[PDB]
Amino acid sequence: IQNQAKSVDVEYTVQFTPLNPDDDFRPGLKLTKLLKTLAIGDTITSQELLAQAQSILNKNHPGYTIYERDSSIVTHDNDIFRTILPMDQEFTYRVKNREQAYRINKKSGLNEEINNTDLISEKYYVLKKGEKPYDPFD
């Protein structure tokens, strides 16, 4: 690790799946929200992510609530190896150490540094409030 990234923009994307059908949940949603810019070693906890998802859920889908988390994944920059966060327990994610990102200047062929990014992507099962899970009893 030669040139440690100086910052990591943590972006967030979440997909919501209703326990029983609803059109408003059009598949294909593709947006990210910048959560914050942190430093290598800073942490983000599952409770903080839940708060983020619940608030996003409130804006886009009033009347629904988080039922349960299905998966949480972090993709670091354009790196192929992703970190899979624990599925059924609270967790903390530490901003992974990394080499400072850069691209090659087309004209000069010299290196120009750019911001490193973490893309945290989650999926939660949601429920219309008032409603309950299950099938016809179990």
Swiss-Prot record:
The domain of life is Bacteria
- Provide the function of this protein: This protein is not a protease, but it activates plasminogen by complexing with it. As a potential virulence factor, it is thought to prevent the formation of effective fibrin barriers around the site of infection, thereby contributing to the invasiveness of the cells.
Could you identify this protein by its name? Streptokinase C
Query: Organism, per UniProt?
Result: Streptococcus dysgalactiae subsp. equisimilis
Boundaries of the shown chain within the full protein: 177 to 314 of 440
